[PDB]
Structures are given as structure tokens and as C-alpha cells.
Design a protein around this ligand. Structure first.
Ligand SMILES: Cc1cc2nc3c(=O)[nH]c(=O)nc-3n(C[C@H](O)[C@H](O)[C@H](O)COP(=O)(O)O)c2cc1C
Lengths: 80, 159, 226
């Protein structure tokens, strides 16, 4: 088994202390209620489209919430 | 019978250290846990050394280095910190061919130079039968690690 | 990881990746990476002793050095042109896990944090005429291997494997075509590490060239060594 998200809170990682504090503050969600990120923050995590449009899981901060809103308002909108 | 064929065994080492012997842990002589490549997280060469000193296999975040010389300085910076004979591996992205135009022509050499980089991992995609062919013999890697995300990406690695 | 480089030191602006399900296990802050990975591994150890070993460790098997296995008592072995290689190496390493087990099956030898092909596995490559001999194969400390290839027709000892003090693998690399005919032997030492499984054999590079210089002395120079 590989452990991605379990690690980012360790002391040997380089994430800033405030970033760890919030990544701890957010309570996860069990797999049964997993897909509800596309719609809402699920215990503090959403998915957003990349610049390639492909999804990315991010902690639901004010910044990434604005990102989400812009995705479904500005960039989804066509070229002209 | 998969319940017995791959039963998770237990192993004692001469030092008296316990181990979870699996098929995977029996190539790496290391617990069957690893940290995947993480461009914000496993890019910091001092952290990728801190865990491999704990004795857990790690991938080095390739996507965090925009060059060939930068990741080389990272590699050598961890080599300066890992214990004698320790090992790590690197993680490459596949949707980023500019990321792949450094590593491969670099990995061939640092391996021919003999670095402790003893596995590769092509994340965010699966190569073709043709390009995924030379990574195991031109690259003196111990094993290769492919990230399936699809149901056909698994058929592909089986190919 | 650079909140010093955001406008008002506010993380709430930042894009930080995480998992929706893994988040409900990450509550203690900044614990050492060894601490959490060990809390996982020994947790598995507790969960596996209670099932298949009855909470008594002594039920454990025992291995000299754990690892090195790809997923896929005093005898001799003559090798010829078609002598298969992997059977050959199996016949030489043996069944027991010891230094002899790795010396032919360990593919890489560390040279002070650098991994280069196994030399022993290079020299013992199966070919014609090589009559290798394993003596005293039961106990490891006294196990010695002697490859004697044909030289000028006759067979003479060319290679000698044996342990030393401190569990130091040495390959007595002999060459007999000498100025005085008496064979010269090149002592190549290696450190065997039962604790590092993936690469137990680590060549001592210290003083390595001098014992090569000293071997080449008696090959060329008709003078004392200095
Ligand atoms: C911060 C972060 C960065 C990641 N970077 C990469 C990456 O660069 N390439 C990749 O293939 N996967 C990347 N992953 C995903 C991991 O490879 C792995 O699939 C994921 O961590 C598993 O999810 P988990 O953390 O819930 O266990 C990243 C994950 C995280 C959390």
C-alpha cells in the first residue's frame, strides 16, 4: 500500500505549519459518500478542473472555492 | 488459491527485526509500504531522504523539477543524505513530454553512472508497448512502477 | 509550502492537494515520518501475529537477510557452453540464505552509495571448462568455493571465495601465469550486510587500489613494493 495524503502532515515534509494545521482541521469523508466533491466541499475538499480540465482534489479553502466558482462560470464558458 | 498463494507472511531478520513478507516486500527487503511521488510533497530532496532513512521506499517527485540539472542537483543532494547503500526512486509524469525529455535521457546516464535510483514510476498515464519496453533494460532499474487509473490502463500494463 | 510568499500569510488562499477519504485519518500534527510508517507496519505486525502466529513471536521464521527475491553438501559443478546461467547460480548460492546466497543472486554491489553490477556474478559467468567446487557447504563460516578453470590445458585454482572475521566476503582472485610461476592472488574484500537486504554486499573501496597495485607489482616490476 502507498500512502499519499497520510504523509503530508508529517514533520519532515516542507508544507508550511499553517497549511498542515488546516489539512488536519478538515475531517474526511468515508468512501460511501465519496463522489460528492464534484458538487460541494466534503468535509473540506473539492475537485476542480485542471488547466487541462482534468480533475484535481484540493482542500476547500477560500482560494480553491473561488477557483471552483470560476471554473463553472468563466472557463467552462466558450472562447468568444 | 489466492488466499494461500499470496498469504501475508512474517519474517524475522538476523538483527531480530520483523517484516511483513509479501511478493513486493521480497524484492525491496523493506516494509511493503511506500510513498508515491508528490510534486509538492516528495519534491523536497531532504524529505525524500528522511523517509528513506526510516527504511520506506519513496518516489522522487519529477514534476517539481523544470530541468535536467535541477533534478540532478536534487538527486545528488539526497545521495548526500541517504545512508550507505540506501535507495529511492523517481516519479515521472507522462502527460508532460517535456518532463519526460529530461528524465529518460538523464536516467539512462545516472544509472550508467550507478546511482541508488532503483526504480521508476510513470504516473498520470501508461506508456505504449513500444515506449514502455526499453525502460527495463536500457534503464538499469530493479523494477518498474506503473500507475493505472483506468480499466484499460490495466489491460495495457498486462500487455 | 511557501506561505511566506503569499500576500497576507493566509493559507485560505492556497491550493493544497489532499484526499477526501484519507483526510479522516490525519489528525495528529507533524509526527515523524518514521513514527507513522512504523505505527502502520507494527500495527500490521500485531494484526498478523494474532491471526497466524498466536501472539508468540518465536513462531516466526528466520532469515539471514530479508529480501532480494525476484517474484519470478560439498559438491562440484562442471560447466560447459550451454550450461544454463540461472540454474548455475542456484547451484552455487545454494538453498540457505547466507552470504553465499547473495554472492550469486544479489545483482548489485554498493560502492559507497553507488550500485554497480555484481563482480562475482560477472566472473562466475557460465562458460566452458570451468569446474567449480563447493566444499563444506553446511556451515557458512567454513564454506569455501574454488573455481579452477583450465589454464594451458591443465586446471588450476583461479578463484577462491571465503568468509573472514567480521563476516567479510573476500574473493581470492588468483592468477597463476606469474613471473615465478607461483600464482599471485588478488584479494578483493566486500562487506556483507544481513541488515540491508536489498544490497547486503558492499565492497570496501577503502585501500582498494593499493591491493591492486601490490598485485600488479609481482606481475611487472622486479623490485620491492613501495
Ligand atoms: C499532494 C499530492 C501530490 C501528488 N502528486 C502526484 C504526482 O505528481 N504524480 C502522480 O502520479 N500522483 C500524484 N499524487 C497522487 C498519488 O500518486 C496517489 O495516487 C495518491 O496520493 C493516493 O491518494 P491518497 O493520498 O488518499 O492515498 C499526488 C497526491 C497528492 C496528495
Amino acid at each position: 500500500f502507498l500512502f499519499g495524503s497520510r504523509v503530508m502532515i508529517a514533520k519532515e515534509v516542507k508544507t508550511s505549519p499553517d497549511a498542515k494545521k488546516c489539512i488536519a482541521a478538515c475531517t474526511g469523508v468515508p468512501d460511501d459518500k465519496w463522489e460528492q466533491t464534484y458538487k460541494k466541499p466534503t468535509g473540506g475538499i473539492v475537485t476542480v478542473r485542471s488547466e487541462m480540465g482534468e480533475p484535481i482534489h484540493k482542500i476547500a479553502t477560500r482560494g480553491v472555492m473561488l477557483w471552483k466558482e470560476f471554473d463553472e462560470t468563466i472557463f467552462n464558458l466558450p472562447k468568444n | 488459491n489466492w488466499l494461500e498463494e499470496y498469504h501475508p507472511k512474517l519474517i524475522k531478520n538476523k538483527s531480530g527485526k520483523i517484516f511483513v513478507e509479501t511478493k513486493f516486500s521480497k524484492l525491496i527487503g523493506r516494509p511493503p509500504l511506500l510513498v508515491p511521488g508528490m510534486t509538492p510533497c516528495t519534491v523536497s530532496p531532504d524529505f525524500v531522504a528522511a523517509t528513506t532513512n526510516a527504511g520506506y521506499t519513496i518516489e522522487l517527485a519529477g514534476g517539481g523539477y523544470f530541468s535536467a540539472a535541477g533534478m540532478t542537483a536534487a538527486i545528488d543532494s539526497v545521495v548526500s543524505q541517504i545512508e550507505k547503500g540506501s535507495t529511492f526512486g523517481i516519479n515521472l509524469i507522462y502527460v508532460n513530454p517535456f518532463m519526460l525529455q529530461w528524465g529518460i535521457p538523464l536516467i539512462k546516464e545516472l544509472r550508467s553512472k550507478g546511482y541508488p535510483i532503483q526504480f521508476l514510476t510513470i504516473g498520470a498515464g501508461v506508456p505504449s508497448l513500444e515506449v514502455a519496453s526499453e525502460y527495463i533494460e536500457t534503464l538499469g532499474l530493479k523494477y518498474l512502477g506503473l500507475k493505472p487509473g483506468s480499466i484499460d490502463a490495466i489491460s495495457q500494463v498486462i500487455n | 509550502e511557501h506561505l511566506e510568499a503569499v500576500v497576507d500569510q493566509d493559507v485560505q488562499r492556497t491550493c493544497i492537494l489532499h484526499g477526501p477519504v484519507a483526510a479522516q485519518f490525519t489528525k495528529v500534527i507533524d509526527e515523524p515520518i518514521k513514527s507513522i510508517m512504523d505505527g502502520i507496519h507494527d500495527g500490521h505486525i500485531k494484526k498478523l501475529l494474532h491471526q497466524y502466529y498466536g501472539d508468540d513471536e518465536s513462531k516466526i521464521p528466520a532469515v539471514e537477510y530479508f529480501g532480494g527475491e525476484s517474484p519470478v553438501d560439498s559438491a562440484v559443478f562442471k560447466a560447459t557452453s550451454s550450461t544454463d546461467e540461472e540454474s548455475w547460480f542456484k547451484a552455487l548460492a545454494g538453498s540457505e540464505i547466507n552470504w553465499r546466497h547473495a554472492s550469486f543472486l544479489c545483482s548489485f554491489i554498493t560502492q559507497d552509495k553507488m550500485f554497480v553490477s555484481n563482480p562475482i556474478r560477472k566472473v562466475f559467468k557460465p562458460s566452458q571448462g570451468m569446474v567449480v567446487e563447493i566444499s563444506n557447504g553446511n556451515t557458512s563460516s567454513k564454506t569455501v568455493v574454488t573455481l579452477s578453470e583450465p589454464v594451458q590445458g591443465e586446471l588450476k585454482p583461479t578463484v577462491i571465495l571465503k568468509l573472514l572475521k567480521e563476516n567479510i566476503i573476500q574473493m581470492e582472485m588468483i592468477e597463476n601465469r606469474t613471473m615465478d610461476g607461483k600464482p599471485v592472488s588478488l584479494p578483493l574484500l566486500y562487506n556483507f550486510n544481513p541488515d540491508n537486504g536489498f544490497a547486503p554486499i558492499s565492497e570496501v573501496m577503502e585501500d582498494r587500489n593499493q591491493r591492486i597495485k601490490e598485485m600488479y607489482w609481482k606481475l611487472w616490476i622486479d623490485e620491492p613494493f613501495n
